[PDB]
Amino acid sequence: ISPIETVPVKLKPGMDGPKVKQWPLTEEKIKALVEICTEMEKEGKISKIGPENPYNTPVFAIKWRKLVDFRELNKRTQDFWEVQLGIPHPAGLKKKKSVTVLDVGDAYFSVPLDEDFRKYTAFTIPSINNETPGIRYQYNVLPQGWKGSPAIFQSSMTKILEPFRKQNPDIVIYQYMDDLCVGSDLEIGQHRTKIEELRQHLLRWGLTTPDKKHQKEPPFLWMGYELHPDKWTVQPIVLPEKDSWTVNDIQKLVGKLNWASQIYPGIKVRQLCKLLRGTKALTEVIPLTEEAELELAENREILKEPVHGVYYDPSKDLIAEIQKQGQGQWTYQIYQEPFKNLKTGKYARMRGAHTNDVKQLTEAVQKITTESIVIWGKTPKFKLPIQKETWETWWTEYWQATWIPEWEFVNTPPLVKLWYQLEKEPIVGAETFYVDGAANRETKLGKAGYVTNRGRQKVVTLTDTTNQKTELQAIYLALQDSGLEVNIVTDSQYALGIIQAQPDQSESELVNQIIEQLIKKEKVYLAWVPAHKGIG
Amino acid sequence: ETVPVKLKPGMDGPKVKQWPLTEEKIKALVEICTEMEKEGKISKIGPENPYNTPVFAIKKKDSTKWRKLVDFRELNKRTQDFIPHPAGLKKKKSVTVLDVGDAYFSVPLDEDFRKYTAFTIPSINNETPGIRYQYNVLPQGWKGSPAIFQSSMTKILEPFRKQNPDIVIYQYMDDLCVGSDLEIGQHRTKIEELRQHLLRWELHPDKWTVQPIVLPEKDSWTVNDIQKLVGKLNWASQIYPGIKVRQLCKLLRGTKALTEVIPLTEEAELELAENREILKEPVHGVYYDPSKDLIAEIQKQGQGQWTYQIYQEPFKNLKTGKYARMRGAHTNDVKQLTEAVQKITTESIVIWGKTPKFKLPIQKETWETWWTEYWQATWIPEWEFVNTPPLVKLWYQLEKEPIVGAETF
Ligand SMILES: CC[C@H]1C(=O)Nc2ccc(F)cc2N1C(=O)OC(C)C
């Protein structure tokens, strides 16, 4: 019946075909369906069956249109490779003299189904006299909404396009969903001609496409962007305008803005997000504060501006430049020619238990690198706000293996630097503070203090504290009460980690206070010693 | 003719994702695969096959051409079970490794098992669906390939073995390790002789052991000096219970300046002496257990230096050592680490005959996006990413080094 070879399909091991009862349907709904299945049978899409067929699926009606529910069949159907969920990004596309888009929607139903598996798709047309035997059928082609259809259809398209592609090297085809997107750098007449050749080639296999009178118009709306065959733009983003905002409204908005932060610089949600505190219900009406009214306002302005883009030229350099927009926050733009970006983005404030700015820069760099490999199969040359000396100093001695691909320095404030650097050896002439902190773990009552070789001492009692905290507070006190250079001895295990990693940011607000003190000193030497020893 | 290989009971085939590759690597893999399919070694597949094994391309030891490397680790683990280790290979003045992974394409793979060898050449920007294949012939890097061909491999080895019995020949996956005491030239001339036999169808184990730890020795010691010493020794007592810091700590009482000089008690004096002696030899009673996994932990020491320990039980090392980066690896922590893992896995194989599981002081993402760029072996070991404990590093930093070094006028 059909030219294309079928793909052998199976039900997950052990499981069996669907057995769902057919809902009762009104008389006009049954008629509509009775007619659609007379035509579908005629066209060859389905076959009249009804004897030894146990399986069944519910048919529906939404001129009427039928809808079969294969959720159950899908639950019983084997697994397939996967119909890739990773779709291309405009930044990776190439500028083409011509691009045509062929909707191959009905091509779905033009691909045969493993006859061996067709029994499973059986469904039934109800009756008025609920009693009478229903009209039974089954599918001969890939059912709309069935599990295997996307995968099998595309595999089929792949084998059918093989020859054409071989005979036409200068032509790029992209298949996705039920859309063939054909592009090239041939003269428009020659391109139009080759499209027609492709259409008749597909048609030779039973696949239909709309004529030149029906094919879709470039610019094409494709997942947020507007594609022109010579550049791309961003479909303008529209922010509502209401007198009453509910939590849903505010979360939806914050959602939209956050997506825009990527392409647009300066979008902010801090004040809008504040509206979400202690909210008791989704439908709750929160009034915008002045600042949220304002913030909302400036964002509307920013989004008015048109953000255009450019395509990828493989004969040109790929460059990535990075900015630290605030602590933990990073912005980047990848381009080829100065000021003509291919892509831009930012990474949400990276927050953790303890790290440093240089380490974070390093991570931003690798996220970019993974994204670039995917988009361009190449790695950008990097222009980073950090001096070579700074990198060489930090990396060369950090405890963890780290790297940054070829890069060059770009002096664009604020630069990424080392906020402090613990001394390598004890400091001659600096007061030496022996610190200690202890707390009852259960009563959460403790004491933190020190004694210095110069005779300075202090102790403070704390309540609702932990042991870890008294120890760290001991260190905090020493830093507060000492001169510009200080030596500090501690048996705290967490200080041992500070010595190794020398973090400039942390979760612990106490550690953060210590860090601020550490940064303030001219010289600090931190020394760890085993606890409960004959030391101190 | 094919032996019916099967999966370990209750196990399914590998469904591992293909990581993204550079453009260069993709072009290369496509060629390589077009050729293999011509030659009937692999065949394109349908979507009804849901299994996958990552694949990638390398350029091992000098080569203006790419080699295809497949990561069958997962598949190997799910594959059923089926020669022991030449205890003396470890004792040969010199070993040389050979890539005999080509022998395998000379044999067909059980029909019903090929589905599990499915792999996918990715496409740039997803502008195209991956190119899927599966093997028809025994694939390089799979654990069954060296077994199912043992028969034919041994067969081709006898005449050479039974010709030199002053040479040990050991096999592991795609490789063959051979060691002899003959001088350098002879060794190689004999190696080539072996390869010639093969065509018809640089290690020196005299260096490896557990390394000696050496405590500082000093004119005068400061409070800080003793403090550091004391913390290292206290940690080390988890290995040698006879190590003690009682006398040293008594010198650490009172609040003296970190830089003040302290005179060592005649007792503390002996204590340091007794300690130095205990550390003169590897701890007693450590033996390899063939039934337990072998562990390999690495620490980054800085300035291109790396220390490692191989053990099965905590603090009971089978071997320990140092690794200094090679030439032109100066700016690449990832290159250095990679190189070290290959060198450590190789010794691991030359000694116990299996690969160890590595504990790596690197962030997972850093390792995953760049390790293949510098890999050169046919095998791939297991690994986990860890945080190095400050003291573990400070301790092994202490191992003794050559007086001058290893001469080579
Ligand atoms: C086939 C040509 C291919 C390409 O290289 N550049 C462009 C440029 C403009 C377009 F509108 C489409 C595409 N192309 C493409 O595959 O786009 C799909 C993801 C929509």
Query: Residue B21: which CATH number?
Result: 3.10.10.10
> Which residues, 6+ apart, have CB-to-CB distance to A503 below 8 Å?
A354, A355, A356, A511, A515
Q: Give the ligand 1 atom nearest the CA of A179.
A: 20
Question: Cα–Cα distance between A7 and A158 in angstroms, integer?
Answer: 13
CB proximity B17 to A under 8 Å: no
- φ, ψ of residue A79 to 5 degrees: the values are -100, 150
CB proximity A142 to B under 8 Å:
no
DSSP A495: H
Instruction: Decide if A30 contacts A136 (C-beta within 8 A).
Output: no
- Cα separation, A277 vs B278, in Å, equals 63
* DSSP state string for B235-286: HHTTT-TT---HHHHTTS-S---TT-EEPPPHHHHHHHHHHHHHTTSPPSS-
Contact A356, A504 (CB under 8 A): yes
Taking phi first (over 0 means left), then psi (-120 to 50 degrees means alpha), and beta for anything else, what does residue B405 get?
A: left
Give the whole-angstrom CA distance, residue A488 versus residue A451: 10
The pick from A94, A98, A174, A182 for probing ligand 1's pocket by mutation, whose C-beta has the most ligand atoms within 8 angstroms, reads A174
Is A432 close to B255, i.e. CB distance below 8 A?
yes
Residue B12 labelled as part of a binding site: no
The coordinates were experimentally obtained by: X-ray
Which residue type, as a one-letter code, is found at position A320? A
Distance A331 CA to ligand 1 centre (A): 27
User: What distance lies between CA A106 and its chain's CA centroid?
Assistant: 31
| Interchain pair A403, B333: CB under 8 A | yes
- The answer as to whether B170 is a domain residue is yes
| Angle at CA of residue A362, ends A359 and A365, nearest 5° | 155
Judging contacts by C-beta atoms under 8 Å, the chain B residues touching residue A500 are 388, 390
A11 and A137 in a common domain: yes
How far apart (Å, rounded) are the C-alpha atoms in residues A498 and A515? 10
Minimal CA–CA distance to A317: which of A340, A302, A337? A337
Helices B150-161 & B184-199, crossing angle to 10 degrees?
A: 140
The tokens describing A209, both together, are 């496409």
**B8 and B138 housed in the same domain:** yes
Residue B2 lies in a domain: yes
Q: How far is the C-alpha of B324 from the C-alpha of B338, rounded, in Å? A: 12
B51 within some domain: yes
Q: How many CA atoms lie within 13 A of B324 on its CB side?
A: 4
CB A113 within 8 A of CB A23: no
Residue B245 near chain A (CB below 8 Å)? yes
Cβ within 8 Å of A, B 250-269: 250, 252-253, 255-260
A477 token code pair: 């006190």
Q: Which among B47, B128, B234 is the nearest to A81, CB-wise?
A: B47
CA distances from B98 to B83, B103, B202 (A): 18, 12, 11
Task: Indicate the length of chain B as a whole number.
Answer: 409
Cα–Cα dist B291/A280, whole Å: 59
Helix axes A467-481, A509-520, angle to 10 degrees: 20
CB B272 within 8 A of CB B248: yes
Pocket probe mutation, ligand 1, options A181, A232, A308, max atoms within 8 Å of Cβ = A181
In a domain, B353, yes or no: yes
| CB atoms near residue B388 (< 10 Å) | 18
Closest CA to B150 of B71, B158, B380: B158
Residues of chain A in contact with residue B23, where contact means CB-CB under 8 angstroms, are 376-378
Cα separation of A384 and A410, whole Å?
6
Cβ(A11)–Cβ(A78) below 8 Å: yes
- B102-111 burial, b for 16+ CB within 10 Å, e for fewer? ebbbebebee
Instruction: Give the nearest partner residue to A84 out of B126, B249, B258, using CB atoms.
Output: B126
Helix (H) or strand (E) holding B135: strand B131-135
How many angstroms separate the Cα of A191 from the Cα of each of A175, A176, A183, A186, A230? 18, 21, 8, 6, 16
Q: Which of A168, A72, A171 is nearest to A122 (CA)?
A: A72
Do residues B204 and B316 share a domain?
Answer: no
Distance, CA of B120 to CA of B4 (rounded, Å): 25
Number of domains in chain B: 4
B197 and B115 together in one domain: no
Helices within A174-289 (DSSP H only): 188-203, 247-261, 270-274
Of A155, A489, A500, the CB nearest to B47: A155
How near does any CA of chain B get to the CA of A401, in Å?
A: 5
Cα A522 from chain centre: 43
Residues B387 and B294 in one domain: yes
The C-alpha torsion from A510 through A512 and A513 to A517, rounded to 10°, is: 140
A222 Cα: distance to centroid of ligand 1 (angstroms): 10
CB-based contact A531:A491 (threshold 8 Å): yes
Q: Could you please report the per-residue DSSP string of A298-352?
A: HHHHHTTS--EE----TTS--EEEEEEEETTEEEEEEEEETTEEEEEEEE-----
Could you tell me how far CA A92 lies from the centroid of its own chain? 17
- CB–CB contact B23 A529 (8 Å): no
Whether B405 maps to a domain, the answer reads no
Closest ligand 1 atom to residue A88 Cα is 19
Report the candidate in B234, B95, B180 with the shortest Cα–Cα distance to residue A528: B234
Q: Are residues B1 and B136 in the same domain?
A: yes
Amino acid at B234: N
* A188-203 vs A149-167: helix crossing angle, rounded to 10: 130
Cβ of B129 under 8 Å from any chain A Cβ? Answer: yes
Last residue of a domain, one of B267, B288, B309: B288
The answer, for B357 touching chain A at a CB cutoff of 8 Å, is no
For residues B317 and B188, membership in a common domain is answered with: no
d(CA B37, CA B16): 22
A398: closest chain B residue by CA: B302
Cβ proximity of B125 and A93 under 8 Å = yes
Residue A54, CA atoms < 13 Å, CB-side half-sphere:
5
Q: For B359, phi and psi rounded to 5 degrees?
A: -115, 110
The rounded distance, in Å, linking the Cα atoms of A438 and A490 is 12
> Ligand 1 site: residues with CB under 6 angstroms?
A 88, 93-94, 96, 99, 172, 174, 181-183, 218, 220, 222, 227, 229; B 127
Query: How far separated are the first and last CA of chain A, in Å rounded?
Result: 92
What's the gap between Cα B202 and its chain centre?
15
Is A88 close to B127, i.e. CB distance below 8 A? yes
Residue B99, annotated as binding a ligand:
yes
CA B234 – CA B244 distance, rounded (Å): 7
Query: Would you say B106 and B137 are in contact if contact means Cβ atoms under 8 Å apart?
Result: yes
Q: Chains A, B: CB contacts under 8 A, how many?
A: 182
Burial of B332 (0-12, 13-18, 19+ CB in 10 A): buried
Q: Which of residues 213-232 of B touch A (CB under 8 A)?
A: 222, 224, 227-228, 230-231
Contact A331, A354 (CB under 8 A): no
Is B160 found in the same domain as B100?
yes
Return left, alpha or beta for A532; rule: phi > 0 is left, psi -120 to 50 is alpha, else beta: left
Distance in angstroms (rounded) separating the CA atoms of residues A16 and A53? 12
Residue B402 lies in a domain: no
For residue A200, which phi and psi values (nearest 5 degrees)? -75, -25
**In chain B, which residues have their Cβ closer than 8 Å to the Cβ of A369?**
369
CA dist B276 and B271 (Å) reads 9
Q: Nearest-CA neighbor of B308 among B354, B350, B341, B352?
A: B341
Contacting B residues, span 145-184, partner chain A, CB-CB under 8 Å: none
Closest to A400 (Cβ–Cβ): which among B49, B331, B361? B361
Degrees to nearest 5, angle at CA B243 with B242 and B246: 115
Q: Which atom of ligand 1 is nearest to the CA of A227?
A: 11
Q: How far is CA B67 from CA A165, A399, B18, B99, B101, in A?
A: 27, 33, 17, 12, 11
Q: For a ligand 1 pocket test, name from A179, A198, A227 the mutation site with the most ligand atoms within 8 angstroms of its C-beta.
A: A227
CA distance B262 to B19: 58
A500 vs A516: CA distance, rounded Å: 18
Atom of ligand 1 nearest to the CA of A229: 9
Distance CA A344, CA A342 (A): 7
Deposited resolution, Å:
2.3
Among residues A267, A283, A312, which one ends one of the domains? A312
CATH number of the domain at B228, please. Answer: 3.30.70.270
From ligand 1's centre to the CA of A227, what distance in Å?
8
Chain B residues lying within 8 Å of A158, measured CB to CB: 129
Q: After which residues is chain B broken (C to N over 2.5 A)?
A: 82, 201
Residues B344 and B255 both lie in one domain: no
Residue of A nearest to B330 (CA): A396
Q: Is B391 left (phi over 0), alpha (psi -120 to 50) or beta?
A: alpha
Given an 8 Å threshold on Cβ–Cβ distance, is B333 in contact with A402? Answer: yes
Question: Which residue of A79, A395, A398 is in closest CB contact with B50?
Answer: A79
d(CA B74, CA B55): 12
| A365 in the same domain as A241 | no
Cβ within 8 Å of B, A 369-398? 369-370, 373-379, 395-398
Cβ <8 Å between A88 and B370: no
Containing structural domain, residue B182: 178-288
Q: DSSP readout, A172-206?
A: EEEEETTEEEEEESS-HHHHHHHHHHHHHHHHTTT
Side by side, the strands of the sheet bearing B94-99 are B94-99, B175-180, B167-172
CA of B131 to the centre of ligand 1 (A): 20
Residues B158 and B134 in one domain: no
- Work out the minimum CA distance from A151 to partner chain B, whole angstroms: 6
Give the DSSP H or E segment for A527: strand A523-528
Residues 6 or more apart whose CB falls under 8 angstroms from that of B67 comprise B57, B58, B59, B60
Q: How far is the CA of A311 from the centre of ligand 1 (A)?
A: 10
Domain termination residue (choose one: B288, B309, B326): B288
Query: Best of A95, A99, A226 to mutate for ligand 1, by most ligand atoms within 8 A of CB?
Result: A99
- Considering the domain architecture, whether residues B95 and B77 belong to the same structural domain is answered as no
Q: Distance (Å, rounded) from C-alpha A334 to C-alpha A318?
A: 7
